[PDB]
Amino acid sequence: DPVAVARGLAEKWRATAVERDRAGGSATAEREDLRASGLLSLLVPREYGGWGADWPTAIEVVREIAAADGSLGHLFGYHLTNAPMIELIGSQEQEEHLYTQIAQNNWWTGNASSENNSHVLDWKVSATPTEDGGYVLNGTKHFCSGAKGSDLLFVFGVVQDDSPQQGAIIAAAIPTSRAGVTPNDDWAAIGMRQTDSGSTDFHNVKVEPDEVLGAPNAFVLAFIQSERGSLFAPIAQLIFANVYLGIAHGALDAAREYTRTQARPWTPAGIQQATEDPYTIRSYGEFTIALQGADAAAREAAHLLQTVWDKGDALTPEDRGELMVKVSGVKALATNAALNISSGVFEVIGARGTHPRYGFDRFWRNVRTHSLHDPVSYKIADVGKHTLNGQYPIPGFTS
Amino acid sequence: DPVAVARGLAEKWRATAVERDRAGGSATAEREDLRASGLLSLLVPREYGGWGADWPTAIEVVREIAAADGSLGHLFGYHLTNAPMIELIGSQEQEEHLYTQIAQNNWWTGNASSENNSHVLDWKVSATPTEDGGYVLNGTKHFCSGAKGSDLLFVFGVVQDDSPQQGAIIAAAIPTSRAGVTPNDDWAAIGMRQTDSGSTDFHNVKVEPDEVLGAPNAFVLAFIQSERGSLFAPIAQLIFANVYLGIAHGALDAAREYTRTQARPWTPAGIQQATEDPYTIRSYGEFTIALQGADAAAREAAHLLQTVWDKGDALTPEDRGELMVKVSGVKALATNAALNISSGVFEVIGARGTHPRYGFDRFWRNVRTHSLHDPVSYKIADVGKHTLNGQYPIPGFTS
Amino acid sequence: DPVAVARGLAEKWRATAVERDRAGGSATAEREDLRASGLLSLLVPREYGGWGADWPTAIEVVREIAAADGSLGHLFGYHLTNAPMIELIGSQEQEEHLYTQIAQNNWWTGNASSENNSHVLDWKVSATPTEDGGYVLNGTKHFCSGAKGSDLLFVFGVVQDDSPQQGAIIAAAIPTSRAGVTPNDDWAAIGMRQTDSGSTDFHNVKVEPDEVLGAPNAFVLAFIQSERGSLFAPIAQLIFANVYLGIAHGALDAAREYTRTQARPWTPAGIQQATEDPYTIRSYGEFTIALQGADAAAREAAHLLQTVWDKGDALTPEDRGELMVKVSGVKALATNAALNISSGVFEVIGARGTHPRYGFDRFWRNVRTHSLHDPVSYKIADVGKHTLNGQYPIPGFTS
Amino acid sequence: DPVAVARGLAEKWRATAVERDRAGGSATAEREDLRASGLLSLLVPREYGGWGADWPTAIEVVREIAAADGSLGHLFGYHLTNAPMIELIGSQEQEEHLYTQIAQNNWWTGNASSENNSHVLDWKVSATPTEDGGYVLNGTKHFCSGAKGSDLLFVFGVVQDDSPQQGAIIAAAIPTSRAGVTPNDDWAAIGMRQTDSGSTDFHNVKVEPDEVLGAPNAFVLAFIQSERGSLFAPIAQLIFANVYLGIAHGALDAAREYTRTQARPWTPAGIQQATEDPYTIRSYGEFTIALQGADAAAREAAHLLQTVWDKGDALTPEDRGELMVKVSGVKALATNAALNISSGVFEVIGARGTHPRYGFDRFWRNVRTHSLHDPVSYKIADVGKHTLNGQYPIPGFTS
């Protein structure tokens, strides 16, 4: 049971959770706990050496880790979205080889991919086609995810050479240790302080032909067609939503334990014990209930993702669309719930809980930070567009 | 397929939904539509002539009807909760006898049972013991459910006699047409106008010995022990929540249809198509998303109810407690979502949509009425008590 | 003391508030109460025979009436907005003559004015120029305000003549009793049921030159220039906002009195006294607080309207602009508080409060109806545009 | 004009707000700015050399400061609660003596006062009576306000000696530099980091007879009787609330400027200007509107505070009660508005705005910390008890 193993790591990590949040930098030791656990091959078929877990199970693992550490939740979760990219646009040969290498070596995969808010011809990383059918990467990807400690890096570049291939997105999986690749210790933010989300430099970085995932612009073409490559956004977004849900659970549990041990009753109102306060009880109710709704929706979307995933290349543009609509709603549900609980929980904790040795603001800071990755407003709009007009979201990296 | 049948009834009923809400009284013709559909025996075991459907399916049928007509959803829905009472405290012979006649005769079951907020010694219907092992009923049950058109009536009376049975709640299933039983044409409310929830008078109504369900005070004892009789509340409460969700879908679908065909864009804002307004789109998103979360939680709870139901008498106080805690949360989720959607949908419908010929306020009026059956605040409180203090709710008729 | 006069009317109207809502039609007797009270000349200057009240006092009067009856609040409030149109675009002579006639004859003013959701050549009322400098009106104004019982009617027509004046909006003040004018007994809605907001047909209705208010397109010119005529919207929107607040107070008071005397405590939760239930108490707090913020903002906006009104024609587009932004916020605050309180009040009232004899849903239905006159989403947007970009609302009939 | 002084300080302090927040510790240079500004004697009567400012003006001064820096806002605001304490329970000679020196020396006043959530014999600071009519203080006050840098310290001690004075709270104002007084450099919290709110040790600290403010137990007596001394809670709570409103404005302004200058439009949605995003516009609208209502309510409470303050001893317990109810609602509004805006502002700011060099989370951390001083839940409950039952708050240090 990967979920039990994940909880084991959580047990270990909580003892250093405050300090690690305070220190920032890379979670080198915890990255190693995860590597050693075997959990990095969670979604690799058993037959290539992995766990062969299904999407609902994998998502439970993300949630468990995220409750202990928002940054480790994001790191591991974003790791899981990477390999499937091999499947969604790569060949059967790349897929077995790379999946096998990932399971065999317990590889961390990282991400230096989409520039979600830039016209492709403005992307900082250029891909120059070479005679042997490969490409050369140049530039800096400024916001990466888990590139720093990774073994295998999933990179996107745009052909900006004024050939007719101009504007083509090139997808590749290359060793992070390839010459010319520098994942920088670059990252600073109020939250998610240990996700290593700084920049990565590429300086005459060679991509071998067999390291290119599918044809040029394979992703953009799959997006337009809503073929299997278009499962990228629903997968990544559902993971993000469950990271937030784990963080909300983490907040709710830390709060509940503090209320049980350290909180004082408000004696001017005649309350005898902090756990008996009628408004404290109500608040925990509402936190639980909001999460109940959000988690049930997350689980439903995960089972829907499994069903669609099981169709392989036989998924329809309606499948992808219905799935993306559902995941967009989970993203919204998770965002709002996690934000509201992360902050609201202080009310039942009380003044002495603001001491930094509790680090109770880390949950909020962690969600407040990543929830800005892409605007929740257009996640809501996409749902409304579908409800009202039956229109599906425009396939892209985040919708 | 009972849902197919119910959806068939839904289309037919929708054409007169506005007038019926405005007229009130009994939906005599639609009740007969239900009788004729064969659907009244939905939850009756296959071996006695019923459909032998499981709880999740029965709930989908309820949701289908509730979306077309809130009163009929509740009426039918509450009907389904009555018979199982036989199973929960009645005997093996009572099940075989009553289930067979319910299914074979296509009987409406009605309800004149608990007075949920009155001390038992204050209940208006007394059961005075008779020598032959029966009872005679006297008094008026001021709030009933479906008694009026029913064939079989489930009644509670309290022994306030002086006998050794004194203070005990007696449950019985007797024919509604028995002498002394007068279900009054009594019901008035801003909403749920066709649910026939008026008073029923009892004047020397004799209950035969084999019509008595379980020992004297069986429900109360089952509650203390959390034995099978204590599933009453989780069942009815889950039924209610899904009525509210059905009503929310009816409101949301009605709005969508009107916005698409009848709504005008706000041209002072330069909007050219009502369906392309960014705030209209956002609002439809928010409605869907709140329902998405509430529906998913309701459905999980339906499966947990099935699980617990299938355990028969081997259910534990732990099984019952966890279930009620989950249903309590669904009741809250559904209450809030149906209220917000029922009311909010007006924002995107527009001024001309307030005309009575649309009856667009019926959804809100239906949810607003029944959501007061028992206070959502203590549904919320019960969840908080479990989350914070690990307490399960005290078993009773509404918790 | 006009507020004292208003409380006197409220006390008179109180016993039959339920009855009036159920009957719909015209509040013929109560419209007469208002006429006899002298309050219709509240905003007419003392020098012309009126009370010469300031805007804050006039708005206090509106709130009293609205608290007693949403429809009468609306009728009286909209009446107050019509008269100033004489001042804002009429000549000094029309001003002295009409103000004097309104005050001396105690005239009801009515409205068959803007078609807020149509470009002018799509307006249903045509204004055809006559040699003598007058106009003839033809067509139907489908949404009117107080036209049915009025003495003086403010009408808008569009020159659709292929005249040189074509496309011009003509504003006029004519007797409702002029031949060819037919205010229909046409109005039906779930709420605001006695506001006589039906259609008015115009059949070759003559408007004399001295009945024309300002130049052709006077409103549009004054708006574009943000001259004094452009105060219509802030005046009208501030009145609307205070009607809603008045209705919110009405619901809150009705609820409280019911809770104090008739609400039952929830005994399964062990509550002995309903007025001591902790969640009931919290809910009344939240109702009061929402109202506390919204009322204080409204009052501040009233004094700002006064300051601006007193600048006469020396007001700048900045004065008008800042004022409208302030009123836009009050409109949003009032809309939301009145909707939330109108409905939420049921939670603390209980099941028996759904009986039609209490008509407790009249408050919500009234606000729910009129809050759709113009979209609150764009009141909110106008505020946001100003906060972020310093942009002022585009002047029109609702902004 | 003290407000012009406050605005001058605030402009300067905004510039170093980010670093000072990250550094924590004491704001020594800024505390010295305040002293030099003359602003510390704001509430000292003109006849003793102070500003003699009225409450609305003093409260505006707190807001100005808080918008720039929440910590300085709390420090200065709490300082201001100390001064009136001389008036409300001291003698006329103490008034002349203490007020003169504060104004002349520009003294910081600090606080080792009430234990708002502790029973009197449980207070850590005991007051042992001395022969000369003075007291000796022993123990450590764990939560102080501005004690560390103060010149004059207001201390409460409880008689726990088994004299006839047992249980009496003794109030005194002593020089902070008195032997035996040790303010520890103790303060740490996620927010309000520069408010110097740590512990202060008292070790056989002598209180001279003329240093005692009023009779033994003067405060508790004043509370029970609702005499003038009982204005402490409404004054402190209104000050607190305006700190939150100040912080909320600070958050809002910081966001608006960032959005205008640094925010990226979301190009997948076809947005060309970030300031033209309809949902970005809506959010700023909503932020503005929440603040609009709360500010107006706050300003209203300050004038009511003036009215009651100006009544001197002729204030009634009803005067006190009504004001405290009004202030409670302001406290609730400000808490909620500041929390929602401090956090929500990140949505329209975007990902790069999470960099620590912007310190944009400092607004939330500051409000989130101090909003826990006393539970807003009971501010809400106090309002509801008044609305429903006409009950007033139990006079104390926070109500």
TrEMBL record, chains A, B, C, D:
<comment type="pathway">
    <text>Sulfur metabolism; dibenzothiophene degradation.</text>
</comment>
<dbReference type="InterPro" id="IPR037069">
    <property type="entry name" value="AcylCoA_DH/ox_N_sf"/>
</dbReference>
<dbReference type="InterPro" id="IPR036250">
    <property type="entry name" value="AcylCo_DH-like_C"/>
</dbReference>
<dbReference type="InterPro" id="IPR046373">
    <property type="entry name" value="Acyl-CoA_Oxase/DH_mid-dom_sf"/>
</dbReference>
<dbReference type="InterPro" id="IPR013786">
    <property type="entry name" value="AcylCoA_DH/ox_N"/>
</dbReference>
<dbReference type="Pfam" id="PF02770">
    <property type="entry name" value="Acyl-CoA_dh_M"/>
</dbReference>
<keyword id="KW-0285">Flavoprotein</keyword>
<dbReference type="GO" id="GO:0006552">
    <property type="term" value="P:L-leucine catabolic process"/>
</dbReference>
<dbReference type="Pfam" id="PF08028">
    <property type="entry name" value="Acyl-CoA_dh_2"/>
</dbReference>
<keyword id="KW-0560">Oxidoreductase</keyword>
<keyword id="KW-0547">Nucleotide-binding</keyword>
<dbReference type="GO" id="GO:0008470">
    <property type="term" value="F:3-methylbutanoyl-CoA dehydrogenase activity"/>
</dbReference>
<keyword id="KW-0288">FMN</keyword>
<dbReference type="InterPro" id="IPR013107">
    <property type="entry name" value="Acyl-CoA_DH_C"/>
</dbReference>
<dbReference type="GO" id="GO:0005737">
    <property type="term" value="C:cytoplasm"/>
</dbReference>
<feature type="domain" description="Acyl-CoA dehydrogenase C-terminal">
    <location>
        <begin position="238"/>
        <end position="374"/>
    </location>
</feature>
<feature type="domain" description="Acyl-CoA dehydrogenase/oxidase N-terminal">
    <location>
        <begin position="7"/>
        <end position="104"/>
    </location>
</feature>
<comment type="similarity">
    <text>Belongs to the DszC flavin monooxygenase family.</text>
</comment>
<keyword id="KW-0503">Monooxygenase</keyword>
<dbReference type="InterPro" id="IPR009100">
    <property type="entry name" value="AcylCoA_DH/oxidase_NM_dom_sf"/>
</dbReference>
<protein>
    <recommendedName>
        <fullName>Dibenzothiophene monooxygenase</fullName>
        <ecNumber>1.14.14.21</ecNumber>
    </recommendedName>
</protein>
<dbReference type="GO" id="GO:0050660">
    <property type="term" value="F:flavin adenine dinucleotide binding"/>
</dbReference>
<dbReference type="GO" id="GO:0004497">
    <property type="term" value="F:monooxygenase activity"/>
</dbReference>
<dbReference type="InterPro" id="IPR049992">
    <property type="entry name" value="DszC"/>
</dbReference>
<feature type="domain" description="Acyl-CoA oxidase/dehydrogenase middle">
    <location>
        <begin position="118"/>
        <end position="205"/>
    </location>
</feature>
<dbReference type="InterPro" id="IPR006091">
    <property type="entry name" value="Acyl-CoA_Oxase/DH_mid-dom"/>
</dbReference>
<dbReference type="Pfam" id="PF02771">
    <property type="entry name" value="Acyl-CoA_dh_N"/>
</dbReference>
